[PDB]
């Protein structure tokens with residue numbers, strides 16, 4: 001299940017290729033990187049903290065979770 | 074002067090070299106050169122053919138390595154072949170004999186090289202079962218060529234190269250094979266039956282099985298041969314089924330039985 | 346060892362062309378070239394060959410050119426066009442070996458560990474098998490005879506790849522005799538088989554003449570294999586064999602009876618219809 005470039009007539013593999021998922025799938029990823037600050041959200045501070053501790057903290061550290069032994073959400 | 078109906082004699086060695094290289098190249102087109110003599114304005118002789126390395130550029134002028142060609146020519150001159158090169162052949166597997174747009178220009182360069190160099194197209198996958206699809210082409214510069222003889226229309230062109238230009242941009246030249254008596258029955262040794270093969274007694278169990286099957290088929294043929302003769306009344310006067318099928322069956326059965334009996338007998342009396 | 350070598354049309358046509366090429370101007374008893382082939386199991390398949398600059402002295406039988414660098418770079422270029430074919434064996438056209446040939450084979454062994462030599466007698470156009478194959482052997486002979494650097498026969502035959510097969514058939518087409526040849530070709534093949542058997546038996550006669558008279562050394566080998574051959578004859582006229590032979594011959598006879606009788610019946614059926622048709626035409630004409 002690998003992507004390889006072969007000879008157009010003799011079909012001999014003469015290149016390996018990076019796996020291509022789909023054009024749409026490549027469209028889904030974010031490249032513009034929007035700029036809305038957390039301070040721009042008002043009143044939702046508790047929910048913001050919930051989402052941050054659920055998502056960002058597993059990204060940044062992974063040590064405070066493993067030191068406990070928890071599976072991050 | 075202006076060319077004519079002309080002819081091109083290619084030798085047995087050349088033809089086999091071309092066919093072998095083409096069957097090696099399929100499905101990728103391959104090309105090489107033939108050595109020969111411009112013997113006269115009315116025929117061109119080619120003897121021996123050497124293939125040349127298959128570059129990724131495909132069949133083109135760039136595919137002709139000058140170093141390989143030059144040193145191959147030098148070493149053939151040393152080995153005893155001083156034959157100066159006219160003619161290039163290439164393979165078109167899966168489609169008929171015709172000069173593609175690339176081929177037109179390659180032959181234009183080749184003609185500019187000597188003058189009367191001849192292009193050769195071989196289809197190695199259609200040249201099979203005893204038929205060889207070989208053909209040879211030359212480019213035109215009103216009147217395509219001089220028809221001063223009848224040996225120009227002893228052959229017939231083909232529609233494939235007709236649209237691809239068998240008379241339009243290039244013209245096909247009749248192809249002849251200059252085999253000699255020495256190559257004759259030198260090649261024949263390949264299918265030549267050996268004397269032990271001649272005195273071989275086949276296989277008695279298999280021969281009995283063969284007779285068993287053929288006589289039963291004879292019975293089933295005669296069954297409807299009876300009906301055919303019983304409808305002799307000549308309603309709506311009409312070669313399928315009984316008569317000639319019975320003929321071929323009796324012929325093959327009789328010859329097989331006769332030859333087996335004769336071989337068995339000869340072996341019995343001669344071998345002790 | 347090597348049990349078989351199969352030789353394709355291309356090499357034999359190439360060596361014929363080489364012989365005509367050299368004998369055209371430089372007529373010489375032989376020409377020498379190099380074969381290319383591949384190995385399946387322990388059988389060898391040879392389809393490629395090129396001429397190499399060669400020279401032999403007339404009688405010194407030790408003086409010889411075979412071109413090293415020419416052989417090497419010609420092989421390199423033939424590998425460039427087709428890399429499957431590697432150097433196996435060398436060919437020459439002389440109908441006879443020479444005391445000088447084993448040196449040629451030893452040189453060729455530098456390029457192939459078990460290089461095999463092939464004699465292709467182009468001039469002969471005779472009974473059969475225009476190719477002879479020989480390997481190099483060096484062994485103690487196991488019987489007290491002095492050991493020697495020797496050539497040993499290996500059986501050879503002609504086989505064709507499909508492209509070479511259509512190529513050869515197309516050229517043979519005009520002189521080609523049919524493969525089936527119901528009666529004529531089969532009877533001629535049996536007569537030719539008797540001819541070949543007689544020729545081989547006469548050759549064995551001449552060998553035994555030379556051995557008994559002493560001008561040829563006793564090989565001990567083969568001659569005892571020849572004695573095994575002589576004890577292998579079946580000795581027909583043993584009674585149960587006679588009974589079986591009569592039974593099978595009678596089966597062939599009844600089968601050919603049926604075929605001949607049906608042939609007579611169909612012949613009569615054509616005859617009667619032809620008579621009816623021509624008589625109908627005659628009656629209508631009036």
Ligand SMILES: [Zn+2]
Nearest residue numbers: 132163173176
């Ligand atoms: Zn082309």
